[PDB]
Design a protein around this nucleic acid. Structure first.
Ligand code: ZN
Lengths: 140, 155, 98, 60, 127, 206
RNA sequence: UUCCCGGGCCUUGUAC
RNA sequence: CGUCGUCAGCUCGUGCCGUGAGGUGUUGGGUUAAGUCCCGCAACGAGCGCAACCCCCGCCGUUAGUUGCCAGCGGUUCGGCCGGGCACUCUAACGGGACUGCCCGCGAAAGCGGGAGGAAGGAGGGGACGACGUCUGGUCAGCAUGGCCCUUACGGCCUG
């Protein structure tokens, strides 16, 4: 419910420091997605089609949402700064400001803009994220 | 085998009797892949049984089968370069295997000139409880249960 | 009443030649029997891959000949002149027998 | 596979039975086939190089 | 009127023709029993008949070619199965579970170079 | 080891026979012998021209020879005289009115035999082996050529011990049938013996 | 899968 | 060309760690015939590998019926023998079909157990295919070639 990308399955190690390599996978996913919707699929007998289906499914699961990033982002929003410490390190290394919904077991110093709250309790995340996205939409 | 369980092949039941034990028996009689000859031998033998002994030879065959069916077997074990003929339980499949095997070898062992008469005599005697196959079964049984001290080697 | 023999090593060019002949004949008036496929003949050569020893190598090669039949019925004169004129592919071999 | 041996096989040897077959490429006389007139090694090489019309790797 | 089935097993091919009648079977213009004379497995051909309370309704004309006697019988079996299926589809519901509508597809394996016959390696000793 | 011929593996599909004609058992041997003789003569002569392939066709008591050359200028000559004598040669060798034809290969960097003879000549001229191989593979890679691989046999730089060099880049799927991998072998003769060079080039699929 | 033979991978002591 | 061995392994690009040699990837849990696949994991991929693409066998269909075949017709000196017909087998070419595809249940997933439809059911059965390399492996007597050696002889021709 916004133009902003997201990562919600598993943070692949090196989405930022190795952005080009992951962009290669983005391109690959684009090419597959184009191919399956093309009238040239009558070649490549059924079994190879099934293999390509598996490949496409995997890339769709993992790389969905990330596809929107045509280049490096402008900021990062993380639910848990500790669970996603790798993303925090990458953002720090590439001078990308960090927004975190931290808790009692987090490091405040590693986040530029910190929201002291909860990481469990679905209600809390719902409220915070809803407010944030509403502020995003309103300011466009 | 290291992974699988080696599924048992399901034999096609015999035509005249509609039985699988008969098929297994005739298969065990087989040599050089001559099915027709083995079946002819079996049929002649059962006809001889019918003439000599009043009742149907199917029942006498089966009765001999569970007569010559053992329960204990001794198996070798290699611990510190020594032999340990531990007794062990036999599954019904294994029971059937050795039963049929002993029956056939004993049939071939008789001094009668014709094969059919040999197998018929062995069958009737094994049904009664005398002959080579029976004596061998009590042989293996007495070899078993005589070294019960080795039973701790569960294996 | 005229039988047309097609022999080849490559089945594709043989089929193309047979198709050309049948089409040309069919255009030229009278009907034809149609392409009759015949059992291909196979020659086999087993060799030793090694130049000196290891007689357990034994690579295989095959040479197969494909056959056709046309059997044009009710010959027409202009049909006849239509034959022996159409240039055949290089690989294909032709034979005519009444 | 001496040269002299190569030319010795190309003359009528006064009788039929003395005549035999030599490889037309290397002069071997041990594994020559009537159909091609080549030894097994030369046959294999030429088959692999694709210089034999219709001859192909067999598998069935 | 023609109830037809193919039947193929181990290189043997059959052609079966069932028609209403008193239950007379003939192969190659000869009696069944005479043709497979002495073969204990002959009766292994027509249990597809007795499975469906046939053997009293159908006269059979069989033309069978290729393979050996056992293959002959198996081809006949599959042929009659297919013909009975062609007669009335419902029979399938009671034929398939018994294993009569499957085409057995095990043939002679190709003899392989380096082996005596396709599996058996030449004996070697004194390692 | 002991990889098979990449061409012989694909005779059925993606590759085609060099010789295209039919003959019975009665006259197979004679045609094959004369074809071999023709190929020998042509390879001996036109080496300077940069020979690629020799196609032999027969239709009816006649031969249609097609020659793939890097530079047709050498073969044809100043006003088409050379070919004439060449024709005569073949006409003298086998008296069945042969019809010589010349075809020029587009972008000679994408023909394995040409790369092979080039590298062989480099070796014969006492070049540095490794550097030459890297240069060759890079040159092949520049002109599309989805894969390139070059192997040199042994006896590098007149050494006492033979050794394979080998170098490749791109995709070279030798195991896939639908590969269309072009193959070329050349032999180089030097003061210290013979060297073998192999070149594989991978061009698309299907 | 205890043992006989032949392999693969992961673990530990003394030399290049 | 043989063998390790049709064993499953051998590497690279970019990014991360360490001052550096280097490491990660390629380890751990599980599962496969497999570095096959899933999850976890500072790594994401790629190349040679495996698998697939190719051939044969197994089911069906469309073109094609002579030297192949003979179900329903008419003769037959009763043997497809003739007249006759491509229904069937076959013969070849082009395709369809098998994909854990559907259902029940068990698992976080790869998957597992059991069913149905099918000729075939969980790499359907074989073939061709041999990775980086090891073995100073084999072959100068298939051939090609470096260096030595002989050239009234170690060359060549006949009989035994
Ligand atoms: Zn030769």
């Amino acid at each position: 419910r916004a133009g902003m990308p997201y990562v919600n399955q598993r943070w692949l190690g090196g989405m930022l420091t190795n952005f080009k390599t992951i962009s290669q996978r983005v391109h690959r996913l684009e090419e597959l997605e184009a191919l399956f919707a093309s009238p040239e699929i009558e070649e490549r007998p059924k079994k190879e089609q099934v293999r390509l289906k598996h490949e496409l499914e995997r890339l769709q699961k993992y790389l969905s949402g990330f596809r929107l990033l045509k280049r490096l982002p402008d900021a990062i929003f993380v639910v848990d700064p500790t669970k996603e410490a790798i993303a925090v390190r990458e953002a720090r290394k590439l001078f990308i400001p960090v927004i975190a919904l931290a808790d009692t077991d987090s490091d405040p110093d590693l986040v530029d803009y910190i929201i002291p709250g909860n990481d469990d309790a679905i209600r809390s995340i719902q409220l915070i994220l809803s407010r944030a996205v509403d502020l995003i939409i309103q300011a466009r | 085998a290291r992974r699988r369980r080696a599924e048992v092949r399901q034999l096609q039941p015999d035509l005249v009797y509609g039985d699988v034990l008969v098929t297994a028996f005739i298969n065990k009689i087989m040599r050089d892949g001559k099915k027709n000859l083995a079946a002819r031998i079996f049929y002649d033998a059962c006809k001889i049984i019918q003439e000599k002994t009043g009742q149907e030879p199917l029942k006498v065959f089966k009765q001999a089968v569970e007569n010559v069916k053992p329960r204990m077997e001794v198996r070798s074990r290699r611990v510190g370069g020594a032999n340990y003929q531990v007794p062990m339980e036999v599954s019904p499949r294994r029971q059937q295997s050795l039963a049929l095997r002993w029956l056939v070898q004993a049939a071939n062992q008789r001094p009668e000139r014709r094969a059919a008469v040999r197998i018929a005599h062995e069958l009737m005697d094994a049904a009664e409880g005398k002959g080579g196959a029976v004596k061998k079964k009590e042989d293996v049984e007495r070899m078993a249960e005589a070294n019960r001290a080795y039973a701790h080697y569960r294996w | 009443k005229i039988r047309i023999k097609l022999r080849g090593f490559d089945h594709k060019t043989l089929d193309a030649s047979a198709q050309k002949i049948v089409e040309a004949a069919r255009r030229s008036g009278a009907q034809v029997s149609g392409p009759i496929p015949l059992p291909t003949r196979v020659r086999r050569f087993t060799v030793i891959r090694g130049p000196f020893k290891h007689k357990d190598s034994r690579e295989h090669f095959e040479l197969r000949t494909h056959n056709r039949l046309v059997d044009i019925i009710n010959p027409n004169r202009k049909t006849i002149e239509q034959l022996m004129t159409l240039d055949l592919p290089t690989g294909v071999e032709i034979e005519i027998k009444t | 596979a001496r040269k002299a041996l190569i030319e010795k096989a190309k003359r009528t040897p006064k009788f039929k039975v003395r005549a035999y077959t030599r490889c037309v490429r290397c002069g071997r006389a041990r594994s020559v086939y009537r159909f091609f007139g080549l030894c097994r090694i030369c046959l294999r090489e030429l088959a692999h190089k694709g210089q034999l019309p219709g001859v192909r790797k067999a598998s069935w | 009127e023609q109830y037809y089935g193919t039947g193929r097993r181990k290189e043997a091919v059959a052609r079966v023709f069932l028609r209403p009648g008193n239950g007379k079977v003939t192969v190659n213009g000869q009696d069944f029993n005479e043709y497979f004379q002495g073969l204990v497995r002959a009766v292994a051909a027509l249990e597809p008949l007795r499975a469906v309370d046939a053997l009293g309704h159908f006269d059979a004309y069989i033309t069978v070619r290729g393979g050996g006697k056992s293959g002959q019988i198996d081809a006949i079996k599959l042929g009659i199965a297919r013909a009975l299926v062609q007669y009335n589809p419902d029979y399938r519901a009671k034929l398939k579970p018994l294993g009569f509508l499957t085409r057995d597809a095990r043939v002679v394996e190709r003899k392989k170079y380096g082996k005596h016959k396709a599996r058996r390696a030449p004996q070697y000793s004194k390692r | 080891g002991n990889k098979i011929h990449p061409i012989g593996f694909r005779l059925g599909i993606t590759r085609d026979w060099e010789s295209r004609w039919y003959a019975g058992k009665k006259q197979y041997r004679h045609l094959l012998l004369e074809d071999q003789r023709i190929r020998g003569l042509l390879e001996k002569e036109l080496y300077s021209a940069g020979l690629a392939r020799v196609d032999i066709e027969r239709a009816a008591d006649n031969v249609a020879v097609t020659v793939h050359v890097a530079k047709p200028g050498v073969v044809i000559g100043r006003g088409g005289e050379r070919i004439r004598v060449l024709r005569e040669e073949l006409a003298k060798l086998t008296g069945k009115n042969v019809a010589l034809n010349v075809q020029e290969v587009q972008n000679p960097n994408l023909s394995a035999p040409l790369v092979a003879q080039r590298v062989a000549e480099q070796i014969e001229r006492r070049f540095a082996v490794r550097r030459a191989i890297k240069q060759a593979v890079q040159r092949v890679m520049e002109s599309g050529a989805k894969g390139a691989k070059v192997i040199v046999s042994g006896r590098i730089g007149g050494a006492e011990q033979a050794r394979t060099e080998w170098a490749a880049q791109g995709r070279v799927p030798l195991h896939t049938l639908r590969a269309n991998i072009d193959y070329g072998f050349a032999l180089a003769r030097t003061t210290y013996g013979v060297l073998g060079v192999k070149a594989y080039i991978f061009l698309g699929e299907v």
